[PDB]
Amino acid sequence: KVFGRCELAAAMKRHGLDNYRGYSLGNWVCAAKFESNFNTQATNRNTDGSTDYGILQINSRWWCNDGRTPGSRNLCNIPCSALLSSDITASVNCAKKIVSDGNGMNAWVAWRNRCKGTDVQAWIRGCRL
Ligand SMILES: *ON1[C@@H]2CCC[C@H]1CC(=O)C2
Numbered sequence: 001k002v003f004g005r006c007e008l009a010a011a012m013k014r015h016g017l018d019n020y021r022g023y024s025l026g027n028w029v030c031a032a033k034f035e036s037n038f039n040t041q042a043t044n045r046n047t048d049g050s051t052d053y054g055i056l057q058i059n060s061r062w063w064c065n066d067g068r069t070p071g072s073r074n075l076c077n078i079p080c081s082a083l084l085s086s087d088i089t090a091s092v093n094c095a096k097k098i099v100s101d102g103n104g105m106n107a108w109v110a111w112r113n114r115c116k117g118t119d120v121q122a123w124i125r126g127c128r129l
Pocket residue numbers: 061062063071072073
């Protein structure tokens with residue numbers, strides 16, 4: 001599923017991401033925008049053999065099981081395919097663990113490089129939330 005901007009902001013908020021670990025909704029929407037362009041079925045293989053999955057491109061080396069990432073953990077205890085669903089619950093649940101891991105949203109390199117320090121509030125402008 002390819003979400004609309006405001007549409008995703010609303011699902012993120014419903015699933016309790018808005019101001020989770022102090023990161024405003026606009027941070028979460030910008031992250032999704034540069035990670036997946038809002039497409040729940042986004043996959044991207046990494047040079048290390050790992051794969052990033054879903055709306056927030058969660059990585060198979062730590063966070064989910066895809067059966068082909070030698071030496072991986074599955075800290076969210078979830079098949080990585082569960083992160084590709086139209087329903088964002090699993091992704092959101094896993095992101096909560098990632099963002100609590102100690103480095104905040106810096107764990108998303110594209111959030112660091114493209115969202116961090118920017119007017120993230122523009123991402124939720126116009127939305128009925
Ligand atoms: O998820 N990462 C963390 C750091 C090493 C590589 C993977 C697997 C792990 O044990 C934790």
